[PDB]
Write an enzyme that holds these catalytic residues in place. Structure first.
Site, mmCIF file in Angstrom:
data_model
loop_
_atom_site.group_PDB
_atom_site.id
_atom_site.type_symbol
_atom_site.label_atom_id
_atom_site.label_comp_id
_atom_site.label_asym_id
_atom_site.label_seq_id
_atom_site.Cartn_x
_atom_site.Cartn_y
_atom_site.Cartn_z
ATOM 1 N N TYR A 154 54.264 47.978 -10.184
ATOM 2 C CA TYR A 154 55.592 48.370 -9.797
ATOM 3 C C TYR A 154 55.775 49.900 -9.949
ATOM 4 O O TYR A 154 56.245 50.573 -9.024
ATOM 5 C CB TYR A 154 56.567 47.593 -10.669
ATOM 6 C CG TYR A 154 58.020 47.758 -10.327
ATOM 7 C CD1 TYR A 154 58.603 47.063 -9.264
ATOM 8 C CD2 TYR A 154 58.830 48.555 -11.117
ATOM 9 C CE1 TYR A 154 59.969 47.163 -9.012
ATOM 10 C CE2 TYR A 154 60.167 48.664 -10.889
ATOM 11 C CZ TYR A 154 60.745 47.972 -9.842
ATOM 12 O OH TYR A 154 62.103 48.092 -9.657
ATOM 13 N N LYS A 158 56.779 52.433 -6.879
ATOM 14 C CA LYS A 158 58.020 53.191 -6.927
ATOM 15 C C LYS A 158 57.826 54.706 -6.824
ATOM 16 O O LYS A 158 58.570 55.365 -6.105
ATOM 17 C CB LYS A 158 58.802 52.838 -8.199
ATOM 18 C CG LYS A 158 59.325 51.415 -8.192
ATOM 19 C CD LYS A 158 60.077 51.164 -6.874
ATOM 20 C CE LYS A 158 60.914 49.894 -6.877
ATOM 21 N NZ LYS A 158 61.808 49.903 -5.685
#
Ligand SMILES: NC(=O)C1=CN([C@@H]2O[C@H](COP(=O)(O)OP(=O)(O)OC[C@H]3O[C@@H](n4cnc5c(N)ncnc54)[C@H](O)[C@@H]3O)[C@@H](O)[C@H]2O)C=CC1
Ligand SMILES: NC(=O)C1=CN([C@@H]2O[C@H](COP(=O)(O)OP(=O)(O)OC[C@H]3O[C@@H](n4cnc5c(N)ncnc54)[C@H](O)[C@@H]3O)[C@@H](O)[C@H]2O)C=CC1
Lengths: 278, 301
Positions: A154, A158
């Protein structure tokens, strides 16, 4: 004058709930022609559209995966004849301690978050150029900016999004296409970030390439600073790792750090360093 | 005392030329057992050959050091670590340097232009690093290098795919820094500037020959040494100069008031404040960021 989006077509991805839906509802209520998208994983999107229509606003739904980006923009074009705002919000979680991240746990996260935003934004790009108008929002996260246990996949996706935006800012500024990135956050009501997204996507807003942490009613802005550093090499003398170690304190000293803003400036500094040594 | 790597096993991906090669030679000259990896293809993602890696392993051998080659694509990351385990028996440092370019204006970046850059840079680094992770945890020691770039940090015309992958590597390292802490596994990121086949098109020829890969190797060696304590740093490096980067955040503004809906106009009205960096803070963790948002709730109520 109050912020209106009358006549502006706004595509919001993953708007079936949370942040997305809150943006969908905030926008439409100010006159925006909203294309609500959500993979529904078809009722997810439909429900928000209904809420909008019921509220006295205009909207349509799209049920495709951001992976099928071209289709989400087609829905905006075939339905409203244009696309002005793209809020990339779709996302999923596959948290695992690094060693336990399977290839799929990695791939799926990159696909929805990064590849998804690239596909969708790429589909709308030329239309924004030709018309000389565009507002784009990338959704990063604190886990990307700072890192966070169990989210290697993640956090990489991002910050990758931030990287995408940095370039889009460069390629789009001449055609009035702005791209900004947010790191949003029971009591942390999604309606506390929506207003920032509305401002950043408004025609009167001049902000381009900004990075913002948002949550609880607060908003802050982030930028890089760089130490003046050290030249640790002398002409005709090979550079050694010992010189790096012996100058480490100076290299890491942020007193009077510069605020670098473009690759040209960075490259220009490196070339000047070469000249000083010579 | 001179920095040495005796008894350390160093894997350098893409060590067949440019920066990777300079790193492998520098490490090997200092006692390290080096696995020099290189797929042997071109800088656009087409090709494969064993000579790239074989030549470096030969150059190392002639200089009196010890290295072994690995011909696999970083996309088969796990195989590079296996070469390290099968040949030397351990893995101390991982320098993720393999990379390619696929520059195109945003609208013209094809799906393959995007995917291949991600596969080699980001997914490849993740694969190589993930394969070494448990070994470093068992050794309670490890040094990892992610190679980002100025284009990823500042953005750069015609490189949206490359820039996203490069900052993507930084977000990967941010987390590895937290998870590897208790086991002395350091992870640092660099944004190098050196003349190579991959930079000719963005550098006058003479600048290419003058910005030596050997001016960045020294930094990589220090950040991978047992006595270095730097962990999670981001450095720009070139020509003999080194600098460090970090985030700075505005004190900002609380635009919301107790029981009074937050509006877009309010945000616009506090824009100068929201964007003013005087006395900005230097955030370092998600916990402090979360602690902050929670404090905003309290201050408001
Ligand atoms: N709420 C929070 O505290 C934070 C949220 N974020 C980010 O904000 C965004 C949305 O967050 P939330 O609303 O809280 O999460 P969420 O999980 O409720 O929203 C994501 C939406 O994406 C949709 N979606 C999933 N895969 C999709 C695909 N392939 N194509 C299209 N739509 C798809 C889902 O149906 C869902 O409604 C995400 O990108 C998330 O990473 C980042 C940090 C914190
Ligand atoms: N030289 C510079 O100014 C900059 C370099 N970089 C990065 O530094 C790294 C090295 O760059 P250079 O030495 O300049 O380029 P280079 O082309 O000389 O070296 C890259 C090496 O990677 C190898 N490689 C490519 N795909 C591979 C794969 N799938 N598996 C294994 N090896 C593979 C190539 O065969 C080559 O030997 C790259 O990650 C690049 O993006 C980033 C910014 C600036």
């Amino acid at each position: 004058s109050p912020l209106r989006f009358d006549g502006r077509v706004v595509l919001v991805t993953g708007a079936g709930g949370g942040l997305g839906r809150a943006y969908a509802l905030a926008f439409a209520e100010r006159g925006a022609l909203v294309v609500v998208n959500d993979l529904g994983g078809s009722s997810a999107a439909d429900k928000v559209v209904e809420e909008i229509r019921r509220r006295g606003g205009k909207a349509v739904a799209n049920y495709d995966s951001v992976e099928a980006g071209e289709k989400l923009v087609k829905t905006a074009l075939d339905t409203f004849g244009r696309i002005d705002v793209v809020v990339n919000n779709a996302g999923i979680l596959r948290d695992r301690s690094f060693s336990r991240i399977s290839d799929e746990d990695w791939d799926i996260i990159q696909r929805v978050h990064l590849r998804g935003s690239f596909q969708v934004t790429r589909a709308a790009w030329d239309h924004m150029k030709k018309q000389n108008y565009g507002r784009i929002i990338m959704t990063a996260s604190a886990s990307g900016i700072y890192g966070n246990f169990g989210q290697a996949n993640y956090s990489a996706a991002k910050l990758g999004l931030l990287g995408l935006a940095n370039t889009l800012v460069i390629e789009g500024r001449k055609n009035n296409i702005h791209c900004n990135t947010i790191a949003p956050n029971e009591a942390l009501k999604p309606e506390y970030v929506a207003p920032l997204v509305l401002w950043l996507c408004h025609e009167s807003c001049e902000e381009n390439g900004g990075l913002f942490e948002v949550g609880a009613g607060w908003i802050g802005k982030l930028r890089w600073e760089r130490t003046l550093g050290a030249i640790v090499r002398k002409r005709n003398q090979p550079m050694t790792p010992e010189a790096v170690r012996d100058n480490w304190v100076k290299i890491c000293d942020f007193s009077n750090a510069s605020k670098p803003k473009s690759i040209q400036e960075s490259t220009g500094g490196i070339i000047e360093v070469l000249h000083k040594i010579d």
